[PDB]
Design a protein around this nucleic acid. Structure first.
Ligand code: 1RZ
Ligand code: CA
Ligand code: CA
Ligand code: CA
Ligand code: CA
Ligand code: CA
Ligand code: CA
Ligand code: CA
Length: 327
DNA sequence: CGGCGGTACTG
DNA sequence: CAGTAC
DNA sequence: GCCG
């Protein structure tokens, strides 16, 4: 775009973070939409009226946008609770969300050392905690490619016809990635089955996977792996890796889901529901509603899902937000 | 005013 | 079930 | 927070 309201969005984002770490998620959702709407606007907002006219912006947000626009900052930023930056710190641990972070706060911890030395930690959070720094860093797009190639090469050693694709921010074209998302399927509709057993064992053998966060290996029909990998060679960081294995008939919906963004996926699914459909990572489904399951519409490609939702195909680089348009 | 995406693990 | 995650 |  070119954010024409940069000075405004900066400040609303601080505020938004604050609700977000305090656990006030709907409020934080509201801020995020407004903020995207400001960023995409053709010009600096100049009037309260013009602010309210924007979908995503109502009275309370227009008051703020205006106050910032005239007076040059936002009072409310100097009343944010002091606990917020601790709650953010604790929430940046993988596996600890706002509840854990609040529990730790009421136990009086205020730093990661208070966490290590005294807090009770789930298995996941202990892993989250020891890799705190590495997991906060975004990786270059090129390290993501090598991670994906590792997973793919290990998969094709078992079956050369297996399809592997990196999704997430990578597929949306970004320069850096918070974590790598790999989608595996097989066009024969069948040989995706039992992959995780073999694939995980192989990736552990040569030391690439260093920890597992979610991986239900008791289940032969396991569909997801969330864990931690590390490319070989000196000084490499530990990275988050997510792998999903799906049947080929689910490929377009899984691809769409895994490409995201999160906000994009939410809006798509909200749209589907407005049309008596249901959109998931597994399928797009018609005639919903206790509720009734409705039937799967076949969707051999992502274009089919867009078409059935009455939208034009959206290129992966333009899937940051649904309500963001224009070539 | 109530709804705000739909689903998969963990414990 | 609540919590966290994708 | 905003929307229907
Ligand atoms: N709450 C969520 C989270 C993710 N998603 C979907 C499924 S996984 C895909 C990408 O999500 P990630 O959290 O890896 O974000 P991105 O890849 O966009 O960015 P970075 O990893 O931060 O580079 O989005 C979702 O539908 N709902
Ligand atoms: Ca509006
Ligand atoms: Ca966390
Ligand atoms: Ca590939
Ligand atoms: Ca991810
Ligand atoms: Ca990602
Ligand atoms: Ca396990
Ligand atoms: Ca309310």
């Amino acid at each position: 775009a070119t954010n024409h309201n940069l000075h405004i969005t900066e400040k609303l984002e601080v505020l938004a973070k604050a609700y977000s770490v305090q656990g006030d998620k709907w409020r934080a959702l509201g801020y995020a939409k407004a903020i995207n709407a400001l960023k995409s606007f053709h010009k600096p907002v100049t009037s309260y009226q013009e602010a309210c006219s924007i979908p995503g912006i109502g009275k309370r947000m227009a008051e703020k946008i205006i106050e910032i626009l005239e007076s040059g900052h936002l009072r409310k930023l100097d009343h944010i609770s002091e606990s917020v930056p601790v709650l953010e710190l604790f929430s940046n641990i993988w596996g600890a969300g706002t509840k854990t972070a609040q529990m730790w706060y009421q136990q009086g911890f205020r730093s990661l050392e208070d966490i290590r030395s005294q807090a009770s930690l789930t298995t996941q959070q202990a892993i989250g905690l020891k890799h705190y720094s590495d997991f906060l860093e975004r990786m270059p797009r090129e390290e993501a490619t090598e991670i994906e190639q590792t997973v793919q090469k290990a998969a094709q050693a078992f079956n050369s016809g297996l399809l592997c694709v990196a999704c997430g921010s990578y597929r949306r074209g970004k320069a850096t990635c918070g974590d790598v998302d790999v989608l595996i399927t097989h066009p024969d509709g069948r040989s995706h089955r039992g992959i995780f057993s073999r694939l995980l064992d192989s990736l552990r053998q040569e030391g690439f996977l260093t920890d597992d966060l979610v991986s239900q290996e008791e289940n032969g029909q396991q569909q997801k792996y969330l864990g931690v990998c590390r490319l070989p060679g000196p000084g490499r960081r530990h990275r988050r890796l997510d792998i999903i294995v799906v049947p080929y008939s689910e490929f377009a919906c899984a691809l769409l889901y895994f490409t995201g963004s999160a906000h994009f996926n939410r809006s798509m699914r909200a749209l589907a529901k407005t049309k008596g459909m249901s959109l998931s990572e597994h399928a797009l489904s018609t005639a919903v509603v206790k509720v009734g399951p409705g039937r799967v519409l076949p969707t051999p490609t992502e274009k089919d899902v867009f078409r059935l939702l009455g939208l034009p195909y959206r290129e992966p680089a333009e899937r940051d937000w649904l309500e963001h348009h224009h070539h």
